[PDB]
Amino acid sequence: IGLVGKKVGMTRIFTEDGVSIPVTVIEVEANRVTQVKDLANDGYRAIQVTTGAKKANRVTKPEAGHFAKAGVEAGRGLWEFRLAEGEEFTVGQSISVELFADVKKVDVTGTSKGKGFAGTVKRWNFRTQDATHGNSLSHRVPGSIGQNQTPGKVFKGKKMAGQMGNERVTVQSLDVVRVDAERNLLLVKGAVPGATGSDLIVKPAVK
Amino acid sequence: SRVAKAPVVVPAGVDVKINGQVITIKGKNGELTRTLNDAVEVKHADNTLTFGPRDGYADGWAQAGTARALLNSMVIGVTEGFTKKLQLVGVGYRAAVKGNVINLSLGFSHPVDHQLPAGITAECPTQTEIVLKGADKQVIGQVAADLRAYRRPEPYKGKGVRYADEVVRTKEAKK
Amino acid sequence: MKTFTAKPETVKRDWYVVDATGKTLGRLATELARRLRGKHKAEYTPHVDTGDYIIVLNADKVAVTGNKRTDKVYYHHTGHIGGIKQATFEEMIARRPERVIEIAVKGMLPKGPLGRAMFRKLKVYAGNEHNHAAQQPQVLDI
Amino acid sequence: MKVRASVKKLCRNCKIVKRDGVIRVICSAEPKHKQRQG
RNA sequence: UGCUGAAAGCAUCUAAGCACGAAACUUGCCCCGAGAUGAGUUCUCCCUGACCCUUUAAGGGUCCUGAAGGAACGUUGAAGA
RNA sequence: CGAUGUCGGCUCAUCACAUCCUGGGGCUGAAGUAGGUCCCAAGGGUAUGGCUGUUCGCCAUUUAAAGUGGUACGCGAGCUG
RNA sequence: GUGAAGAGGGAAACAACCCAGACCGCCAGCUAAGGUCCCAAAGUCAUGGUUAAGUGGGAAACGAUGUGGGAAGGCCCAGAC
């Protein structure tokens, strides 16, 4: 199972070799467990985690009653992680950051930075026509989106302009560089999704 | 029909139990089992398993012949056991057994270590030869075909896991 | 005199259970479609579903003759450009084993609103245990 | 294997047999002789 | 490609049975996804008052009540036409 | 014909298998390497420039390969002309 | 001959192909072409076969111990393959 961190910022790690590593600093607080789901009660084996601390006058009464019956402090959200067979988590447990005291690669999932109503050249990496040589009102438009009269329909999944990003995307197998048990940090290498202040689900790797 | 007409003479020391359309057979070399076809009547004629078709079908005599030859091979396996031989002609092509793996060595940079199934035992006296004993003729022919399939014998030098019961033909490496 | 036309407020419905551990798929599905349209009922009308609820328990051991368990194929188009997905009988069984009977009767039944209502009255199960024993269903040799 | 559309015995050792619905010529001696009606 | 094997005493990769086999197909990896009208599952929270009427019904009207929450407004955002 | 805009280039492509590579094989007048030919297979991939209006070509130089076709010889209510 | 100048029923759809010539009304019966498991009115009708290919439900030269039927045969109970 994974952790729910908050991407603080990117920086370097130097080694004694002299190499430079692009290191992302995922802070990971003590993830509380709120509700453990098994087969006979619910339908699968999976736990529910939460982090942070919301305002008392902002958590509503369903959420607050859920957390208070769960027996933990009022968090800031909910996430749900499947349980590979061989994990029996108690409902009062608090998953620390030392879960990654043995892994080398993690898979990091987060909301990518939404870039607006990005066109085709920005979104699907099209090309352009010429900027001179006669070209008129067609410097960056899509172009031909079909055939003549057969199909007589733009085929579904045609690549067009729309909203780029602001979607859950996942990078696979980034190497963990450090686990700071004191500052509550997980230092990975690379370029995780999300901006500063995004919430990233960090899982141990599959591939 | 024609092989299905003269039935099998089961000797002493080898029990048989007709479990409906299943037949089981027991003895000194281990037991075998065969689910017979659902168009074939077998019967135990007190020293001899006689054969015929159950009618309502036109696939009678072919299936009854198969049932007779299968029970013959089952009786021969349980009372004597078959004993096949493969060999490894080439340059240093060498085998060994370790209980139930055949640690081959056939010029393959990964080691070919085939795991033999249950009712099969092996012995490699000469280190270019394998002799393996068994009760079920189908599975010992299967394991022998697996070892020959690891290195099919070429037509240029006769190397590879050549059958000791089937010689091959070798084309001349001409020019 | 305009003859009888069964009003859907006053017509009554029964509950049937069909065993399917080796019935032939086409013949079984035809008889399900006949009792589902309601043509075993003498108050029959076209525009009113006078059908009967049918629970087909053990809907994966439906036996098909021929070589159809490896040769009969099923096609459905996704909706995209290249998307013509296609699964054989045993592979459709291994994916979702009630879709076979549901596709068979969804081919035989009428089409449109009343055909989809008559199909809504047909709920099938891949096991020997249903959960509609509170309805008092009766077994039917079909 | 020559995948002819008319298989035809070419010696005495060749045997015409039927796998899978197609016809084949299988030979014991010459692997040029092996054919299949396809 | 085979192993065993008969119709066809032999033979035979096949009609009974079984094993191997590809970037192809189903999966495995990522994403959408209960408007999936077949509208699913689990958890949490909140509402525990009166009458009046005729056609008695899953009916209408009146007095008190207005919860959970949502919506609106404002300061806005690495969210955005 | 009270009109469906007709070659080529750009930009988008999508499909078929009679496959150019990659995958699996059988035969070889296959020692190895490189091959020849045939069978299964369409998941991905499939060149930059010189000259011409070109498709095509010839040429220079790479590449694992520089596929063959349809789609109004795709595509001008998208673009040169 | 039919359409043109002709409706209806069949061939899924389908001027000319098959049955057929609409004066009007009827919640009456018989029937032709074609059909009778379900969509879709009517035989999961009876009798005896043939097919294992989804042939039926697109197709040739040519090839094949697929399978059924007939008739002629040439070796064979002094021993046939």
Ligand SMILES: [Mg+2]
């Ligand atoms: Mg933005």
Ligand SMILES: [Mg+2]
């Ligand atoms: Mg450009």
Ligand SMILES: [Mg+2]
């Ligand atoms: Mg202009």
Ligand SMILES: [Mg+2]
């Ligand atoms: Mg401009």
Ligand SMILES: [Mg+2]
């Ligand atoms: Mg156009």
Ligand SMILES: [Mg+2]
């Ligand atoms: Mg259309």
Ligand SMILES: [Mg+2]
């Ligand atoms: Mg095959």
Ligand SMILES: [Mg+2]
């Ligand atoms: Mg061919």
Ligand SMILES: [Mg+2]
């Ligand atoms: Mg054999």
Ligand SMILES: [Mg+2]
């Ligand atoms: Mg034999």
Ligand SMILES: [Mg+2]
């Ligand atoms: Mg297999």
Ligand SMILES: [Mg+2]
């Ligand atoms: Mg690959």
Ligand SMILES: [Mg+2]
């Ligand atoms: Mg694949």
Ligand SMILES: [Mg+2]
């Ligand atoms: Mg014109």
Ligand SMILES: [Mg+2]
């Ligand atoms: Mg006009």
Ligand SMILES: [Mg+2]
């Ligand atoms: Mg092909």
